[PDB]
Design a protein around this ligand. Structure first.
Ligand SMILES: [Zn+2]
Ligand SMILES: [Zn+2]
Length: 216
């Protein structure tokens, strides 16, 4: 029910926030990014719905920023819900091979472009994809913007509680978070999927929460 939000975070970097009512959770916000590269837009995660995906795309297109592509950080609908709509508009969609395998298992439309293995450049030296290992989901990836030092952690970054454990790997999450913290300690900003933007301390807080959740 709250409207899509689009807010500038940094030069060429915007945070989009969409909202869903989730049974037992109440209203759940979902953050992704729009990243501008030579005045074209890349969507980092789609909103939950085709409606908010269209609103997001239109906001940029009507301002002269063509959509070059989207990438989805994991198979959950809060990262993937707009894939069908983007595909229908011939906008390239990206997801890991494993994310696409889990979408297909969940009866969902797949991204048209897949990648495997651990580091992938969506845009050489500008938008990097990294797989830290299983945590929130088996397939969760993070997106790094090296020129800005901004990490989109997505639903893997859980600084105050692990959220929905439905598809989580509570055994692997601590090792995965330790690796992410080691690689991205230099981050200026970490953008979580469900919590507000913070600094690199969110990598430590996620590790602390994963360690705490394995204990039970
Ligand atoms: Zn999720
Ligand atoms: Zn999520």
């Amino acid at each position: 029910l709250p409207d899509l939000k689009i807010e500038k975070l940094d030069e060429g970097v915007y945070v989009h926030t969409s909202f869903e009512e989730v049974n037992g959770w109440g209203v759940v916000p979902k953050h992704g990014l729009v990243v501008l590269v030579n005045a074209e837009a890349y969507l980092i995660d789609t909103p939950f719905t085709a409606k908010d995906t269209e609103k997001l795309v239109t906001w940029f297109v009507e301002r002269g920023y063509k959509i070059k592509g989207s990438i989805s950080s994991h198979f959950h609908s809060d990262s993937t819900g707009g894939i069908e709509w983007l595909n229908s508009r011939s906008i390239p969609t990206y997801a890991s091979e494993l994310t696409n395998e889990l979408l297909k298992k969940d009866g969902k439309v797949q991204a048209t472009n897949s990648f495997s293995g651990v580091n992938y450049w969506l845009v050489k030296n500008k938008i990097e994809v990294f797989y830290p290992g299983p945590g929130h989901t088996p397939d969760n990836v993070v997106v790094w913007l090296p020129e800005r030092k901004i990490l989109f952690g997505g639903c893997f970054i859980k600084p105050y509680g692990l959220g929905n454990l439905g598809d989580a790997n509570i055994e692997a999450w601590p090792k995965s978070a330790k690796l992410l913290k080691s690689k991205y300690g230099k981050a200026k900003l970490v953008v979580p999927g469900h919590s507000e933007v913070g600094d690199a301390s969110l990598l430590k807080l996620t590790l602390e929460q994963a360690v705490k959740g394995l204990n039970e």
